Amino acid sequence: EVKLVESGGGLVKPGGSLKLSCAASGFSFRNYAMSWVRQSPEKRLEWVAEVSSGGGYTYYPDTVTGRFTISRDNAKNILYLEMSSLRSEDTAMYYCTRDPDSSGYLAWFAYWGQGTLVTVSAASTKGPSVFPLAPSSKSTSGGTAALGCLVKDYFPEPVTVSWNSGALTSGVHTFPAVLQSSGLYSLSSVVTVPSSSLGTQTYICNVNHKPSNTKVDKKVEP
């Protein structure tokens, strides 16, 4: 079962450097070429790096040439992407991909990792406050009551919201983050429940902001 796992993405100041890594399992890594592909905030997809299976042959677009460097360890089954002189316009999600054959060049990507997010930004990480969204009794249109969490004033993306540690999924709507005029992100995660469960089932929202080493669990109560 093919698996690629990005890691090492983060917040970097315009001009700094980073080394992303991708662990690979589920296929003979050493006989395949690999590629790095990124996705801009505006969601345009953009190819970044290709390396032969041997690791001798590396290919790059003009836009990252001489700043990025694709590398590979066929012993530990790991692919790397050394990025330097980072510009604000390389803020992107970074996927490591498998090529279909050993030398590449005419390659589509059947396998992508989950991505790792690089933010090239002057700004400083700031962890969020997570506030209870109170169910009121004005809520109870049709007998369903809505409760949630406001994850507010943090930087950079991402944060993760769970409910009841993953036990609670149906009804949940974790919204995309919004970039406030203050320049921090804010998102809201709601779940709709039987108004009859309000008194008898406690709902605990699990926020995790990996950059700032935050996790909170604000219990939403009626």
């Binding site: 049709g142 007998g143 369903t144 149906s170 009804g171 429940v193 039987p194 108004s195």
Partner: protein, 417 residues
């Protein structure tokens, strides 16, 4: 849209106030369908098409000789005077009429699918410990073609059944819904009584001086020592799940839990609605919007005016937990969600099943009613579906009345006079 359309969007206003006025004028539309005795009616309606089923039996409507199963589909046309009627288009009759049970119908994209139980051991509800789990699923073209072959009528392969902790699952209700290419039929799960997890402290007996905390758990089956309990729910058919998709059971939540009874999921105003017959001590109507289809969670109404006749142990308006399996299916169809107004045919008598009245109601207020007959006339089952014609809310009720079914078309009136 043209002709008959589902109840969606912003329909023409309806009379929103309680009135003893005679503003409902039902119309007997039975004449456009097949007439011995006739039990086990099915009436499903959707997107201008309908599905109908019954079993014509010889003499006795309880144990007579099973003459014929009729499983038929058709279109709901404006019959010529702005009144809707059912016009059959395609009829299928099983080879063995007495091995087909508890048929349930769902429309999707110019096919009715109908899910029935196959049993050589009787009504599975009554001989469950001996019923093979088997299910039959028929797809009917609503508008067949000349040499249509498999398109006109096709018997789909019910290979696998995913049923969780349930011994056997079965359809149990007239009509279901579609979401994309997934059919949800209304179903029942047979559960071995000894695995049934129940908190007797949640049986509600406070003002019930002759009850006991454990009647609920006990009357979750057809006898208090019954081998199975019946939990109502959904049977899920995913039409894009390969060659022969499986059926998957979805149980209904534990909220306001009552014996598995014949139930119904239907769309109204863009969102699904659920109805469960009150076949037990909880005799106040059980219906409300689906909060989520899966797991099945139903925002039950706190309805205080509509019920069903029952026998002497759990009569009409009984609320106290009792050991009883008695009642009739008298469904209702939500016609207005902002005000939660609904229509159905209920029987106005306490312990006798008689006097069918088409009724438009709120949670705790009947708005306006209209007898379909005399107070003497015995009715049993009622199935009501509502829809748009030239943007006007109409309802078609099948009302059982020996016993044969008779169809009424009742337009929901706009003025209150």
């Amino acid at each position: 849209p043209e002709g008959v359309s589902n109840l969606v969007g912003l329909p023409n206003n309806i009379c929103l106030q309680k009135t003893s006025n005679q503003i409902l004028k039902p119309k007997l539309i039975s004449y456009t369908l097949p007439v011995t005795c006739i039990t086990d009616p099915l009436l499903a309606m959707d997107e201008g098409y309908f599905a109908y089923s019954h079993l014509e039996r010889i003499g006795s409507c309880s144990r007579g000789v099973s003459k014929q199963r009729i499983i038929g589909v058709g279109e709901v046309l404006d019959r010529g005077d702005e009144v809707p009627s059912l016009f059959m288009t395609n009829v299928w009759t099983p080879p063995n009429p007495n091995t087909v049970y508890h048929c349930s119908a769902v429309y999707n994209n110019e096919f009715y699918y109908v899910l029935c139980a196959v049993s050589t051991v009787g009504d599975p509800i009554l001989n469950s410990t001996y019923w093979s789990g088997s299910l039959m699923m028929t797809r009917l073209a609503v508008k067949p073609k000349s040499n249509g072959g498999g398109y006109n009528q096709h018997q789909l392969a019910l290979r696998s059944i995913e049923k969780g902790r349930y011994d056997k699952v079965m359809p149990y209700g007239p009509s279901g819904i579609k979401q994309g290419d997934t059919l949800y039929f209304p179903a029942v799960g047979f559960l071995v009584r000894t695995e049934f997890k129940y908190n007797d402290s949640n049986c509600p007996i406070t003002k019930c001086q002759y009850s006991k905390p454990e009647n609920c758990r006990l009357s979750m089956g057809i006898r208090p020592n019954s081998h199975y309990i019946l939990r109502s729910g959904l049977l899920k058919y995913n039409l894009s799940d390969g060659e022969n998709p499986k059926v998957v059971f979805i149980e209904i939540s534990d909220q306001r839990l009552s014996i598995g009874s014949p139930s119904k999921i239907y769309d109204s105003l863009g969102q699904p609605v659920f109805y469960q017959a009150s076949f037990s001590w909880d005799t106040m109507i059980k219906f409300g919007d689906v909060l989520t289809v899966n797991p099945l969670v139903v925002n039950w109404r706190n309805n205080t005016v509509i019920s069903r006749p029952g026998q002497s142990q759990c009569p009409r308006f009984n609320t106290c937990p009792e050991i009883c399996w008695e009642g009739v299916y008298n469904d209702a169809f939500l016609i207005d969600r902002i005000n939660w107004i609904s229509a159905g045919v209920f029987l106005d008598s306490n312990q006798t099943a008689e006097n069918p009245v088409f009724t438009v109601f709120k949670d705790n207020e009947i708005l306006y009613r209209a007898q379909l007959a005399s107070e003497d006339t015995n009715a049993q089952k009622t199935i009501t579906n509502c829809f748009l014609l030239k943007n006007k809310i109409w309802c078609i009720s099948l009302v059982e009345i020996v016993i044969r079914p008779k169809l009424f078309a009742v337009k929901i009136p706009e003025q209150c006079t």
